[PDB]
Motif scaffolding. Structure first.
Motif, PDB file in Angstrom:
ATOM      1  N   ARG A  16      10.916 -38.442 -19.131  1.00  0.00           N
ATOM      2  CA  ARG A  16       9.921 -39.307 -18.508  1.00  0.00           C
ATOM      3  C   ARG A  16       9.201 -38.587 -17.377  1.00  0.00           C
ATOM      4  NH1 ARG A  16       9.053 -44.967 -18.301  1.00  0.00           N
ATOM      5  NH2 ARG A  16       8.287 -45.740 -16.283  1.00  0.00           N
ATOM      6  N   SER A  17       9.905 -37.701 -16.667  1.00  0.00           N
ATOM      7  CA  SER A  17       9.259 -36.899 -15.635  1.00  0.00           C
ATOM      8  C   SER A  17       8.369 -35.829 -16.248  1.00  0.00           C
ATOM      9  CB  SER A  17      10.311 -36.265 -14.726  1.00  0.00           C
ATOM     10  OG  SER A  17      11.030 -37.254 -14.011  1.00  0.00           O
ATOM     11  N   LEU A  18       8.773 -35.271 -17.386  1.00  0.00           N
ATOM     12  CA  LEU A  18       7.965 -34.283 -18.085  1.00  0.00           C
ATOM     13  C   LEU A  18       6.977 -34.910 -19.059  1.00  0.00           C
ATOM     14  CD1 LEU A  18      10.619 -31.497 -18.801  1.00  0.00           C
ATOM     15  CD2 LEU A  18       8.804 -31.475 -17.077  1.00  0.00           C
ATOM     16  N   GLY A  19       6.844 -36.234 -19.054  1.00  0.00           N
ATOM     17  CA  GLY A  19       5.849 -36.885 -19.880  1.00  0.00           C
ATOM     18  C   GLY A  19       6.158 -36.910 -21.355  1.00  0.00           C
ATOM     19  N   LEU A  20       7.429 -36.794 -21.731  1.00  0.00           N
ATOM     20  CA  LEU A  20       7.835 -36.809 -23.128  1.00  0.00           C
ATOM     21  C   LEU A  20       8.133 -38.213 -23.637  1.00  0.00           C
ATOM     22  CD1 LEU A  20       8.103 -34.227 -24.935  1.00  0.00           C
ATOM     23  CD2 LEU A  20       8.217 -33.646 -22.499  1.00  0.00           C
ATOM     24  N   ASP A  28       3.339 -32.795 -12.745  1.00  0.00           N
ATOM     25  CA  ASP A  28       3.938 -32.227 -13.958  1.00  0.00           C
ATOM     26  C   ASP A  28       4.432 -33.346 -14.874  1.00  0.00           C
ATOM     27  OD1 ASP A  28       4.692 -30.381 -15.830  1.00  0.00           O
ATOM     28  OD2 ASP A  28       6.273 -29.450 -14.638  1.00  0.00           O
ATOM     29  N   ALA A  29       3.671 -34.437 -14.911  1.00  0.00           N
ATOM     30  CA  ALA A  29       3.938 -35.562 -15.795  1.00  0.00           C
ATOM     31  C   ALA A  29       2.799 -35.815 -16.766  1.00  0.00           C
ATOM     32  CB  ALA A  29       4.216 -36.826 -14.967  1.00  0.00           C
ATOM     33  N   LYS A  30       1.576 -35.969 -16.266  1.00  0.00           N
ATOM     34  CA  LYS A  30       0.426 -36.240 -17.117  1.00  0.00           C
ATOM     35  C   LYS A  30      -0.465 -35.028 -17.324  1.00  0.00           C
ATOM     36  CE  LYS A  30       0.097 -41.201 -16.215  1.00  0.00           C
ATOM     37  NZ  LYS A  30      -0.770 -42.313 -15.742  1.00  0.00           N
ATOM     38  N   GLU A  47       3.490 -23.142 -14.320  1.00  0.00           N
ATOM     39  CA  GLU A  47       3.622 -24.217 -15.294  1.00  0.00           C
ATOM     40  C   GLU A  47       3.324 -23.730 -16.706  1.00  0.00           C
ATOM     41  OE1 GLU A  47       4.759 -27.219 -14.662  1.00  0.00           O
ATOM     42  OE2 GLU A  47       4.561 -27.867 -16.751  1.00  0.00           O
ATOM     43  N   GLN A  99       0.753 -32.096 -17.645  1.00  0.00           N
ATOM     44  CA  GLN A  99       1.516 -31.302 -18.599  1.00  0.00           C
ATOM     45  C   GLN A  99       1.136 -31.647 -20.032  1.00  0.00           C
ATOM     46  OE1 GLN A  99       5.676 -31.876 -18.126  1.00  0.00           O
ATOM     47  NE2 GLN A  99       6.271 -30.295 -19.596  1.00  0.00           N
ATOM     48  N   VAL A 100       0.864 -32.926 -20.299  1.00  0.00           N
ATOM     49  CA  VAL A 100       0.428 -33.336 -21.630  1.00  0.00           C
ATOM     50  C   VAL A 100      -0.974 -32.809 -21.908  1.00  0.00           C
ATOM     51  CG1 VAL A 100       0.080 -35.345 -23.136  1.00  0.00           C
ATOM     52  CG2 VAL A 100       1.909 -35.348 -21.425  1.00  0.00           C
ATOM     53  N   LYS A 155      -0.514 -29.410 -22.890  1.00  0.00           N
ATOM     54  CA  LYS A 155      -0.027 -29.382 -24.263  1.00  0.00           C
ATOM     55  C   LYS A 155      -1.118 -29.674 -25.282  1.00  0.00           C
ATOM     56  CE  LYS A 155       4.871 -30.500 -23.618  1.00  0.00           C
ATOM     57  NZ  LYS A 155       5.958 -31.458 -23.953  1.00  0.00           N
ATOM     58  N   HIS A 196       6.856 -29.909 -28.466  1.00  0.00           N
ATOM     59  CA  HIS A 196       5.534 -30.519 -28.471  1.00  0.00           C
ATOM     60  C   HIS A 196       5.351 -31.455 -29.657  1.00  0.00           C
ATOM     61  CE1 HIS A 196       5.022 -26.913 -30.987  1.00  0.00           C
ATOM     62  NE2 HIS A 196       4.110 -27.620 -31.630  1.00  0.00           N
ATOM     63  N   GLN A 205      14.567 -26.934 -18.450  1.00  0.00           N
ATOM     64  CA  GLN A 205      13.139 -27.151 -18.247  1.00  0.00           C
ATOM     65  C   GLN A 205      12.323 -26.443 -19.321  1.00  0.00           C
ATOM     66  OE1 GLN A 205      11.809 -25.811 -14.420  1.00  0.00           O
ATOM     67  NE2 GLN A 205       9.720 -26.595 -14.671  1.00  0.00           N
ATOM     68  N   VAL A 206      12.599 -25.154 -19.535  1.00  0.00           N
ATOM     69  CA  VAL A 206      11.896 -24.378 -20.552  1.00  0.00           C
ATOM     70  C   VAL A 206      12.242 -24.884 -21.948  1.00  0.00           C
ATOM     71  CG1 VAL A 206      11.521 -22.024 -21.424  1.00  0.00           C
ATOM     72  CG2 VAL A 206      11.876 -22.426 -18.977  1.00  0.00           C
ATOM     73  N   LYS A 261      10.287 -27.956 -22.502  1.00  0.00           N
ATOM     74  CA  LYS A 261       8.881 -27.614 -22.658  1.00  0.00           C
ATOM     75  C   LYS A 261       8.599 -26.850 -23.944  1.00  0.00           C
ATOM     76  CE  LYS A 261       7.760 -27.796 -17.768  1.00  0.00           C
ATOM     77  NZ  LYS A 261       7.282 -27.077 -16.558  1.00  0.00           N
ATOM     78  N   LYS A 262       9.636 -26.406 -24.660  1.00  0.00           N
ATOM     79  CA  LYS A 262       9.445 -25.938 -26.028  1.00  0.00           C
ATOM     80  C   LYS A 262       9.036 -27.064 -26.968  1.00  0.00           C
ATOM     81  CE  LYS A 262      12.708 -22.043 -25.917  1.00  0.00           C
ATOM     82  NZ  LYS A 262      13.962 -21.494 -26.503  1.00  0.00           N
ATOM     83  N   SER A 276       6.064 -21.799 -17.886  1.00  0.00           N
ATOM     84  CA  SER A 276       7.134 -22.712 -18.259  1.00  0.00           C
ATOM     85  C   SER A 276       6.827 -23.428 -19.567  1.00  0.00           C
ATOM     86  CB  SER A 276       7.368 -23.721 -17.135  1.00  0.00           C
ATOM     87  OG  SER A 276       7.799 -23.072 -15.952  1.00  0.00           O
ATOM     88  N   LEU A 277       5.552 -23.666 -19.857  1.00  0.00           N
ATOM     89  CA  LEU A 277       5.141 -24.326 -21.087  1.00  0.00           C
ATOM     90  C   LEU A 277       4.976 -23.372 -22.258  1.00  0.00           C
ATOM     91  CD1 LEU A 277       2.589 -26.890 -19.676  1.00  0.00           C
ATOM     92  CD2 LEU A 277       4.667 -27.409 -20.912  1.00  0.00           C
TER      93      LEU A 277
END
Ligand SMILES: *[C@@H]1O[C@H](CO)[C@@H](O)[C@H](O)[C@H]1NC(C)=O
Ligand SMILES: *[C@@H]1O[C@H](CO)[C@@H](O)[C@H](O)[C@H]1NC(C)=O
Ligand SMILES: *[C@@H]1O[C@H](CO)[C@@H](O)[C@H](O)[C@H]1NC(C)=O
Ligand SMILES: *[C@@H]1O[C@H](CO)[C@@H](O)[C@H](O)[C@H]1NC(C)=O
Ligand SMILES: *[C@@H]1O[C@H](CO)[C@@H](O)[C@H](O)[C@H]1NC(C)=O
Ligand SMILES: *[C@@H]1O[C@H](CO)[C@@H](O)[C@H](O)[C@H]1NC(C)=O
Ligand SMILES: *[C@@H]1O[C@H](CO)[C@@H](O)[C@H](O)[C@H]1NC(C)=O
Ligand SMILES: *[C@@H]1O[C@H](CO)[C@@H](O)[C@H](O)[C@H]1NC(C)=O
Ligand SMILES: *[C@@H]1O[C@H](CO)[C@@H](O)[C@H](O)[C@H]1NC(C)=O
Ligand SMILES: *[C@@H]1O[C@H](CO)[C@@H](O)[C@H](O)[C@H]1NC(C)=O
Ligand SMILES: *[C@@H]1O[C@H](CO)[C@@H](O)[C@H](O)[C@H]1NC(C)=O
Ligand SMILES: *[C@@H]1O[C@H](CO)[C@@H](O)[C@H](O)[C@H]1NC(C)=O
Ligand SMILES: *[C@@H]1O[C@H](CO)[C@@H](O)[C@H](O)[C@H]1NC(C)=O
Lengths: 420, 411, 50, 50
Positions: free
Chosen positions: B211-215, D15-17, D45, D19-20, D23, B190, B183-184, B187-188, D48-49
């Motif tokens: 896809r769950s983390l919006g990547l 934690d999908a949209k 979060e 989170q962006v 970012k 970007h 997860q971390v 999230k590194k 975590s980010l």
């Protein structure tokens, strides 16, 4: 409700020792309906009928774990590789016992192969830690064989990447050549004297016979080798004071058999935790598909952790090798092997024994002789570097300046015209 | 010499066409005997593999083996790498797991595969990233093997490139993730472009987490090799629609052209060695009845067929045992959830059909719209000067921006 | 497709040389690979005309 | 005030949209307007980010 184990093993007495280890494996897990059956096979005069007898016996046996060990052949034939290939087709797990080549570092080549002995590249681990003993930062790597020495170079660069120190010079060349004197004379002309070697027997004997006459065994030189370089004709031509490494119980296979049996026992009795237990197929005539829980039981072996056995704490890494083996730091003193230290899981412990170096005093050699011959390079720059041909015979004339001062010249070298 | 072509296939390629394929080919016969024996096999278990190979080596001293496969299991070739170490026969791998690429061989092995190494494939992927000016990237690596060599090759490629790459931290993964530390690690990230070297089982989980983390926005991109992306028959729903992949699996270069090229390489090497050495047929007697130290030959084709060219095809092999100029195909995962040929690779040039790069925007059904602004302009001498691409980098220089000119051939 | 360094840096990075004593024009690219000293001469750029 | 545009939230976030949208924050100082029931999730979060 039985677990078959195939033992590709040398001698009938060690087969009986393996069967006794199977009998002792039935003790601490009770009178449960699971049983442990053992089927053993022996040598074949080539690698073909090895693969033949192994494939029919292990398909007709439907084994889970495979234990292979054949050192004692007088020839250079060493590979248990077709057994590993046959099992890795069906992803059947193999516990290699006494093979040590670094070609098993790739799991793409060996899909279901794990062993509890470390390969030679982990010796490079000690070759970093001994530098921590002596604060050395300029080493000379000398590698003959390209079958595995690329992996040793990889491991050494990985260990030097954390400190961001650089190996000053590495050398890869022909396995089995006689003109290594050029290699040693090109390796002579650096400020470093720490020499690291890992080769076969005859290559080590060749470079010892070269370096003895080339005066590279005297004062300041540090010779750090592995286990394959202190035996045979290499030991016959061995320069004294050389520091080598030895596997504790490296050739002792009998206790290693019982340790592997305990590993197989805890792996099987951990395999009965999760469901969907799959069976080895009849892959001789009729079955071509792989075994299902191959990577699953391999990941079970990735979660292995032990506190029992003769070797004690045995554990597999990400490459399936052996973690944290004790080594013996040996020294050669008047053609006699002398124990001068031990190696922990991650630490070096020198004992009370005496360390004798190949040169003079028994003190540690700070062998970085700084080059007083600093090779200066330049280019023909018109206001700065006046370049003239020879005056009389390779000499110059002591001319004066306009202000009463002699023109300082120097004997340089160089070409005359362009290269085409 | 005697050459065997054994092709275990599920797609019905008839054996009589494979026998009569040599007919319309070069039947001039520079050797005195060029014979082929075609065989089929419906069970590719290794016992029968070694059995049929020993039967063919006892079958009038066959000096060349041509093997293909229909199944998608590479371990068959893992057996074949042993077989060259014993039978001493030049063996070529055609299709399936024989076409699937393994890493490292033995110097006493004459086994070769029709394909491309992972480093050549990474060179093709970075050539794609060079040709689309994508410089800021990351690197997600699992414990699938060959990954440290993959990282090292990317690092040595960046260090030996005039591109000006922007590599982010190389993402490392331990095992089948509990989504706690990975997860971390995800999230590194970007950046935009992500390279991914993983397994086919773990790819669904990693891309589902992304896809769950919006990547998986259409600003982002995903480039994988074919070692993780399998055959066209299995396309899961979890893959982002737009996934760039690079594969050797041409469909125009089907099995007939493959075995034609294999026979051409074998007969060309044998004929050119015949003009250099006299007694070309040197074979092992049998698999049965021998002690150690086998009777090794002296003049083999392993040290000789470094150069070979079949009617213009650069089919030459490297010293490590792979193709010098292989055939690669860049594909994407289009909006129809399928795989379409985007660009084939020549000897050096990356031929691109779609120099226009579309969005492939349909990753989900809920995404924001209209961020790429389609902008047209015109050349004027003090305002918009448009030049050709740079010869040194094949990249527009840092103040210049990429554009496209629609250049026609004729009327 | 490998980067190379010719010239005096070629003879230095190969180990054939030990120290470049020359009118070395200090730039960023050579600073990324080897180390320098403080410059003995401060000197810019100019045009020679007739 | 060199102020980035207002990052907003909608729900107990997927934690999908969101989170962006987090970012998008390449700035240092963050004014956060929320309750105690959500700040634990928000700071978990953002931890975590990174
Ligand atoms: C146990 O292994 C031996 C090996 O010789 C075999 O003969 C025997 O049939 C096996 N028994 C069972 C129950 O599997
Ligand atoms: C090979 O070794 C001999 C003996 O040391 C030496 O004279 C010769 O120069 C070497 N060969 C080359 C090519 O340097
Ligand atoms: C090696 O040493 C001996 C005596 O110490 C000397 O005669 C010989 O010239 C030396 N050779 C080299 C290459 O230094
Ligand atoms: C192997 O193990 C023991 C303890 O390490 C060693 O002393 C002995 O030489 C060997 N024992 C047997 C039974 O092989
Ligand atoms: C075992 O297999 C069943 C299907 O028969 C599946 O539902 C279950 O999740 C599996 N359990 C595992 C893989 O632990
Ligand atoms: C290594 O030796 C030390 C002490 O000699 C001991 O404590 C340790 O358990 C040993 N480890 C192994 C793996 O044998
Ligand atoms: C030797 O290893 C053990 C276990 O790893 C541990 O006690 C320590 O790391 C070492 N012991 C020392 C340095 O006394
Ligand atoms: C160098 O070249 C010049 C002219 O090309 C010639 O006169 C001279 O003999 C050459 N050799 C020397 C200076 O050793
Ligand atoms: C083809 O498959 C059938 C099974 O239906 C098998 O009996 C036959 O032997 C196979 N052909 C060959 C050439 O092995
Ligand atoms: C190509 O192969 C021929 C032999 O078939 C060989 O003589 C030649 O050196 C190779 N290379 C070139 C560039 O022609
Ligand atoms: C190799 O690629 C170049 C493109 O730079 C092309 O000009 C050349 O013709 C190609 N070689 C062959 C044999 O087609
Ligand atoms: C048609 O193609 C030829 C290619 O040789 C080119 O010279 C010519 O200019 C083209 N005609 C037009 C109208 O572009
Ligand atoms: C033909 O092409 C030329 C330039 O290539 C230009 O006149 C126009 O595009 C075309 N003319 C006609 C009449 O189609």
């Amino acid at each position: 409700k039985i677990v078959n184990i195939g033992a590709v093993l040398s001698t009938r007495k060690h087969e009986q020792m393996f069967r006794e280890a199977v009998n002792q494996a039935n003790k601490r897990h009770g009178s449960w309906k699971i049983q442990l059956n053992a089927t053993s096979v022996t040598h074949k005069p080539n690698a073909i009928q090895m693969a033949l007898s192994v494939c029919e016996d292990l398909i007709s046996s439907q084994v889970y774990a495979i234990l292979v060990s054949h050192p004692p052949t007088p020839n250079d034939h060493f590979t248990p590789t077709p057994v590993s290939y046959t099992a890795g087709f069906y992803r059947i797990p193999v516990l290699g016992l006494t093979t040590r080549m670094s070609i098993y570092s790739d799991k793409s080549i060996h899909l279901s192969f794990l062993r509890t002995v470390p390969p030679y590249s982990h010796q490079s681990s000690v070759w970093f830690e001994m530098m921590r003993v002596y604060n050395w930062n300029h080493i000379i790597l000398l590698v003959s064989d390209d079958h595995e020495g690329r992996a040793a170079q990889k491991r050494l660069e990985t260990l030097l990447e954390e400190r961001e120190s650089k190996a000053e010079k590495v050398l890869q060349f022909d396995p089995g050549t006689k003109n290594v004197t050029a290699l040693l004379m090109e390796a002579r002309e650096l400020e470093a004297r720490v020499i690291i070697l890992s080769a076969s027997e005859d290559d080590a004997a060749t470079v010892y016979r070269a370096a003895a006459m080339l005066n590279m065994t005297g004062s300041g030189y540090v010779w750090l080798v592995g286990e394959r370089e202190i035996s045979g004709n290499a030991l016959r031509y061995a320069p004294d004071g050389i520091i080598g490494l030895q596997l504790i119980n490296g050739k002792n296979e009998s206790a290693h058999i019982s340790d592997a049996v305990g590993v197989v026992a805890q792996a099987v009795h951990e395999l009965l935790e999760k469901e969907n237990i799959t069976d080895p197929p009849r892959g001789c005539v009729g079955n071509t598909n792989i075994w299902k829980t191959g990577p699953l039981f391999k990941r079970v072996l990735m979660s292995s952790k032990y506190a029992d056995g003769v070797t004690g704490r045995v554990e597999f890494n990400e490459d399936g090798d052996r973690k944290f083996a004790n080594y013996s730091i040996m020294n050669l003193q008047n053609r006699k092997l002398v124990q001068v230290g031990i190696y922990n899981g991650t630490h070096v412990i020198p004992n009370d024994r005496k360390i004798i170096w190949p040169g003079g005093e028994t003190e540690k050699p700070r062998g970085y002789q700084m080059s007083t011959r600093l090779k200066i390079v330049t280019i023909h720059q018109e206001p700065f570097v006046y370049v003239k041909p020879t005056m009389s015979d390779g000499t110059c004339k002591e001319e004066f300046t306009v202000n009463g001062d002699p023109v300082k010249k120097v004997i340089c070298t160089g070409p005359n015209d362009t290269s085409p | 010499l005697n050459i065997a072509v054994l092709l275990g296939h599920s797609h019905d390629v008839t054996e009589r066409e494979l026998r009569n394929l040599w007919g319309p080919e070069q039947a001039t016969g520079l050797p005195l005997d060029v014979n082929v024996v075609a065989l089929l096999m419906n069970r590719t278990d290794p016992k029968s593999l070694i059995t049929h190979v020993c039967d063919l080596m006892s079958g009038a001293r066959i000096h060349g083996l041509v093997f293909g496969d229909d199944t998608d299991q590479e371990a068959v070739a893992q057996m074949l790498d042993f077989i060259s170490s014993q039978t001493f026969i030049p063996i070529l791998g055609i299709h399936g797991g024989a076409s699937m690429i393994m890493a490292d061989k033995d110097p006493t092995s004459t086994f070769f595969q029709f394909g491309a190494s992972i480093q050549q494939q990474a060179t093709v992927m970075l050539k794609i990233m060079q040709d689309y000016d994508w410089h800021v990237f990351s690197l997600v690596t699992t414990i699938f093997p060959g990954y440290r060599d993959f990282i090292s090759f990317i690092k040595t490629t960046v260090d030996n490139s005039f591109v000006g790459w922007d590599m982010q931290n190389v993402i490392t993964l331990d095992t089948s993730f509990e989504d706690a530390k990975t997860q971390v690690q995800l999230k590194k990230i970007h950046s935009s472009v992500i390279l991914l070297y993983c397994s086919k089982d773990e790819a669904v989980l990693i891309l589902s987490e992304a896809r769950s983390l919006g990547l998986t926005g259409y600003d982002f991109f995903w480039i994988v090799p074919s070692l993780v992306s399998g055959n066209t028959e299995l396309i899961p729903k979890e893959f982002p629609s737009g996934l760039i992949s690079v594969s050797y699996d041409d469909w125009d270069y089907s099995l007939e052209a493959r075995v034609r090229d294999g026979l051409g390489i074998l007969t060309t090497a044998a004929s050119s060695m015949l003009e250099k050495f006299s007694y070309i047929p040197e074979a092992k007697a049998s698999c049965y009845g021998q002690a150690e130290k086998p009777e090794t030959p002296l003049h083999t084709l392993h040290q000789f067929m470094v150069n070979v060219t079949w009617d213009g095809k650069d089919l030459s092999f490297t010293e490590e045992g792979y193709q010098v100029h292989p055939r690669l195909v860049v594909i994407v995962l289009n909006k129809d959830r399928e795989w379409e040929k985007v660009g084939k690779w020549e000897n050096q040039t990356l031929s691109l059909r779609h120099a226009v790069w579309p969005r492939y925007k349909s990753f989900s059904d809920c995404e924001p719209d209209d961020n790429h602004l389609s902008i047209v302009t015109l050349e004027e001498a003090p305002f918009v000067i448009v030049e050709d691409i740079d010869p040194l980098t094949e990249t527009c220089v840092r103040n210049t921006v990429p554009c496209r000119k629609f250049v026609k051939i004729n009327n | 497709n490998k980067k190379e360094w010719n010239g005096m840096m070629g003879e230095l990075l190969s180990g054939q040389a030990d120290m470049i004593v020359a009118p070395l024009t200090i730039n960023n690219e050579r600073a990324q690979y080897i180390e320098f000293s403080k410059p003995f001469k401060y000197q810019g750029l100019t045009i020679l005309v007739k």
